[PDB]
Structure formats: structure tokens, C-alpha cells
Design a protein around this ligand. Structure first.
Ligand SMILES: OC[C@H]1O[C@H](O)[C@@H](O)[C@@H](O)[C@@H]1O
Ligand SMILES: [Ca+2]
Length: 135
């Protein structure tokens, strides 16, 4: 069962929470990771298409679209490439077309574009974004 406001009560329920913030309260990737970890969780990993649908439905209920959210995507070693901060394997992927492109060699964190495509992009880790936690 999920904590109240994070999802449903069944044993198979997965728990996510959107953090949409104004520009003075958006966070870098590391700040967002630390925020979710302080609650006992982490930035959201999206391990399969079922979790993608869960998050998309939360976005539809939010009223807003087109917002950029940090996910738990962070580059590891050159041989690893992208990893999830929660340690789970990056098996499922939904990178946007041409991504990750490491544009200008300075993009080591991953963001979700909260549109129907639900696509991922690598971007500068020091950008201030909204974020999604999991527990
Ligand atoms: O702003 C940086 C951002 O610009 C464009 O959208 C693309 O090149 C992306 O791959 C890149 O991450
Ligand atoms: Ca990119």
C-alpha cells in the first residue's frame, strides 16, 4: 500500500508524487535527489510502461502540461552510461528522439517532459526543474 497522496492501497500499487514548483522553489538534480531521499525514497525511476502510465495519469490530474521534471537518471561511468539513482537497472527506456545526445558534453542528468510522449532528455544537472519522488 502507498502512503496517502502517493498512490493506491493494493499490494501491487506503485507510489509516486509530483513536485511542481515555481521558479524560486525548483531544484537542481542533486537537490531533488536529496529531497526525495530525506523522505526515505528517491527520485522516480520508471522501470516499465506500467510505471510510465501511473506517472502520466498523475500529470493529467495536475492540470498542467509541458512541465519538465527530474527523474532519477544520472550518468555513471563511461561504460555504464545512464543509471537510476535508486540502483535499479535501466532496462526500460523512453528517451526522446536522438537522446541522450550529451549536448555540448555537459548533460549528465535526465528529465521527463510531462507531455503525452512522456519522453526523457539528458540535460545539465544544475538546471532548476520540478521533480518526481518515489517511495
Ligand atoms: O537545452 C538543451 C537541450 O536542447 C535541445 O532541446 C536538445 O539539443 C536537447 O538534447 C538538449 O538537452
Ligand atoms: Ca539532451
Amino acid at each position: 500500500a502507498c502512503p496517502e497522496d502517493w498512490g493506491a492501497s493494493s499490494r501491487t500499487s506503485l507510489c509516486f508524487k509530483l513536485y511542481a514548483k515555481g521558479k524560486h522553489e525548483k531544484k537542481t538534480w542533486f537537490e531533488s535527489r536529496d529531497f526525495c531521499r530525506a523522505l526515505g525514497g528517491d527520485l522516480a525511476s520508471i522501470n516499465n510502461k506500467e510505471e510510465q502510465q501511473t506517472i502520466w495519469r498523475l500529470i493529467t490530474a495536475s492540470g498542467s502540461y509541458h512541465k519538465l521534471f527530474w527523474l532519477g537518471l544520472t550518468y555513471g561511468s563511461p561504460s555504464e552510461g545512464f543509471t537510476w539513482s535508486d540502483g535499479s537497472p535501466v532496462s526500460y527506456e523512453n528517451w526522446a528522439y536522438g537522446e541522450p545526445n550529451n549536448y555540448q558534453n555537459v548533460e549528465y542528468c535526465g528529465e521527463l517532459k510531462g507531455d503525452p510522449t512522456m519522453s526523457w532528455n539528458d540535460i545539465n544537472c544544475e538546471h532548476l526543474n520540478n521533480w518526481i519522488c518515489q517511495i
